[PDB]
Amino acid sequence: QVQLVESGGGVVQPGRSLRLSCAASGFPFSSYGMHWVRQAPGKGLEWVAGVSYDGSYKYYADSVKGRFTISRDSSKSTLYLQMNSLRPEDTAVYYCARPSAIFGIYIILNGLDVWGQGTTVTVS
Template identity: 55%
Template sequence: GADSSIVLSQTASEVPRPGEALKLSCEVTGFDVNSYWMVWVRQTAPGKSLEWLASVGASTSPEYHSDAIKGRFRASKDFSRHIFFLQMNSLKAEDTAVYYCARESQRETFIQELYKNLPSDTN
C-alpha cells in the first residue's frame, strides 16, 4: 500500500518566458534516497500521458535523459540535502507543462538492471 510518511515537495509554480532558464527542485523525505531512483516527468495538457524526461540514479549511478530534452535539460541530485533538481535551459513554448518528480517503485538494484544497457549521458 501507499506509505503516507513519504513526502515529495516541489518548487512552486513558475511561468518563465521562451528562451529563459528555470531550475526545478524536489525535496524528499521518508525514505532512503540512496536506495531509489527518482524520475522527472511532465504532462503537457490535462488527460495527456505523462512524458518521461529524466531518471536520477541513486548514490553514484548516472543520470539518463530523454532525447527530447538532451542538451537543454539536466537532472541532478544533492544527496546531502535530499533534493533532486531539473535545470531547464533555452525553454520553448512547447515545454509548457505540469512537471512532476516521482520515486521509482522498485529499489536501486532492480532499476539499475533496467538501465544498465543504456549509455550514460553524464559527460
C-alpha cells in the same frame, strides 16, 4: 510520511532557464534512482529525465537533450532539474517520481510508486 514536494515552477519567457527542486522525506532518498515526468495540459505523461542513486548515470528523453540537466543533493535529500532554452512545448506540470524497488533492490527501471503534487511551468 513518505512523499515528495516539487517547487520552482512558474511563468517564464521562451529561451530562459529554470531549476526545479524535489524535496524528499520519509525514505532513504540516496538509495533510489529518481525520475522527472511532465504532463502538458490536456495531454499524456512524458518521461524527461532520470538519475541513478549516486548521480553517476543520467538518462534523458530526446526532447530535452542538451537543454535539461538532472542532478541530486544527498545531504539535502533533494532532486533537481535544470531547464535551459525553454520552449513553449516545454509547458507542462512537472512531477518527480520514485521508481519502485523489488526483491530489496532499488532498480531504476520499474513502476513509479511515489509522486509529488507537481509544479507548473508555463513558457509563453
